[PDB]
Paper text:
Allomorphy is a post-translational fine control mechanism where the catalytic rate is governed by a conformational switch that shifts the enzyme population between forms with different activities. β-Phosphoglucomutase (βPGM) uses allomorphy in the catalysis of isomerisation of β-glucose 1-phosphate to glucose 6-phosphate via β-glucose 1,6-bisphosphate. The active site of βPGM is located in a cleft formed between the cap domain (T16–V87) and the core domain (M1–D15, S88–K221), and these domains reorient in response to the binding of a phosphodianion group in the distal region of the active site30. Substrate-free βPGM exists as two distinct conformers with different activities due to cis-trans isomerisation of the K145-P146 peptide bond on the multi-second timescale. Allomorphic control of βPGM involves the isomerisation of the K145-P146 peptide bond situated within an allomorphic control loop, which leads to either fully active cis-P βPGM or partially active trans-P βPGM.
The ability of βPGMD10N to produce stable bis-phosphosugar complexes was leveraged to compare the structural consequences of partial allomorphic activation by F16BP and full allomorphic activation by βG16BP. F16BP is bound in a single orientation as the β-anomer, with the axial 2-hydroxyl group and equatorial 3-hydroxyl group hydrogen bonded by the carbonyl group of V47 located in the substrate specificity loop (V36–L53). The K145-P146 peptide bond within the allomorphic control loop (E140–I150) is completely in the cis conformation and the alkylammonium sidechain of K145 coordinates the 6-phosphate group of F16BP, which is aligned and in van der Waals contact with the carboxylate nucleophile of D8. The 1-phosphate group is coordinated by R49 in the distal region of the active site. The arrangement of groups in the proximal site in the vicinity of N10 and the catalytic magnesium ion (Mgcat) is broadly similar to that observed in the cis-P βPGMD10N:βG16BP complex (PDB 5OK129). Intriguingly, in the cis-P βPGMD10N:F16BP complex, the sidechain of D170 is rotated by ~15° in a planar manner so that the alternate carboxylate oxygen atom coordinates Mgcat. The resulting proximity between the other carboxylate oxygen atom of D170 and the carboxylate sidechain of D8 is close enough to predict protonation of one of these oxygen atoms. Notably, the interdomain hinge closure angle observed in the cis-P βPGMD10N:F16BP complex corresponds better with the domain arrangement of a NAC I conformation (cis-P βPGMWT:BeF3:G6P complex, PDB 2WF927, non-H atom RMSD = 0.9 Å), rather than that of the more closed NAC III conformation (cis-P βPGMD10N:βG16BP complex, PDB 5OK129, non-H atom RMSD = 1.4 Å).
Residue numbers in the entry: 1 to 221
The structure:
Amino acid sequence: MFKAVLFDLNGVITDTAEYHFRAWKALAEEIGINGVDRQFNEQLKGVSREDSLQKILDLADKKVSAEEFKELAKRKNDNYVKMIQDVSPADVYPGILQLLKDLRSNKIKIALASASKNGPFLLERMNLTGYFDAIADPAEVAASKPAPDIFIAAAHAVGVAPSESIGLEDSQAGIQAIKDSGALPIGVGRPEDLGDDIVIVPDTSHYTLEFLKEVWLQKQK
Ligand SMILES: O=P(O)(O)OC[C@H]1O[C@](O)(COP(=O)(O)O)[C@@H](O)[C@@H]1O
Ligand SMILES: [Mg+2]
């Protein structure tokens, strides 16, 4: 049997992409950059805080000091944090709470493999802290998804190898990170947003323990 499930946050447990988007747009508008719209934000989502800012700057051919850059990222983050203060248990994605209950009931480890440093605060706001055996710290890994580092760390933080793990992701960079960790990906959403040679479910109501076990057995050799 698998021993752990490694969860993405945004796209799987909940999704705060709207707040990330609004904070980025607000920052761009403050510094006088045109074109940070919903279509552009598709380039931003599965990208890090620093890489997101850089893309926005590049869009304007705007150069900043290293100090300026840190200040702009902080400003966006401070604004984003304000927006997520009202996140509640009602923002947990369909089926997720029951899955976390069933995993814990079966003594399968639960770990967060988010690229977001606001991950722990969001789990608290959704009242999910207690279910998480560990939270990989994206500030203590050498690279963001699609590097496998965060999934490797997530697995290790609960005492398992990725090979003994299922990863749950919603993005291309996320799916690739899981693959390269050696864990088994199951994607949620549309194929073109996920990747190939994986099991995909259309929405998180399909992530049940029964399904995860069946997929596990299908993928063992
Ligand atoms: O890995 P997840 O849970 O999908 O979160 C993805 C988000 O994490 C980030 O890379 C960084 O998040 P923070 O800015 O909250 O630290 C965002 O740029 C991206 O939208
Ligand atoms: Mg995601």
